[PDB]
């Protein structure tokens, strides 16, 4: 029971590493490109204005 | 003036559009996404009321 949590913690950290660098513009934009695109395919598909 | 049912002109007014304008013709037609911004300030139009 004990051990886990600590093992959990670090992960988040990991995570923390990553998103952190995930923020960076050159990243983010990339996302950007994506999203749009993601969306683009999506657009035909998507229908619901769920908010 | 002009009335339109907004869901198409890709079948209902390729007598309009940038794509159309390309004379790229017929498709709901994507825009990948994809780049860099703009605006102006200006026009240089003839003179709208001219005559």
From Swiss-Prot, chain A:
Give me the disulphide-bonded residues: none
Task: Give the subcellular location.
Answer: Virion
Role, per record: P1 is the major inner capsid (core) protein of the polyhedral procapsid, which is responsible for genomic replication and transcription. Forms a dodecahedral shell from 60 asymmetric dimers. Binds to RNA and may be involved in genomic packaging.
| Record text on subunit structure and interactions | Homodimer. Associates with the polymerase complex.
Q: Under what name is this protein listed? A: Major inner protein P1
Q: Report the source organism.
A: Pseudomonas phage phi6 (Bacteriophage phi-6)
- Gene designation: P1
Which span of the parent protein is shown here? 661 to 711 of 769
């Amino acid at each position: 029971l004990a051990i886990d949590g600590r093992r959990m913690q670090n992960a988040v950290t990991l995570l923390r590493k990553i998103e952190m660098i995930g923020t960076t513009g050159i990243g983010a934009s990339a996302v950007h490109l994506a999203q749009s695109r993601i969306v683009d395919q999506m657009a035909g598909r998507g229908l619901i204005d769920d908010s | 003036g002009f009335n339109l049912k907004v869901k198409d002109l890709n079948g209902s007014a390729r007598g309009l559009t940038q794509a159309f304008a390309i004379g790229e013709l017929k498709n709901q037609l994507s825009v990948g996404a994809l780049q860099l911004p703009l605006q102006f300030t200006r026009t240089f139009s003839a003179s709208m009321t001219s005559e």
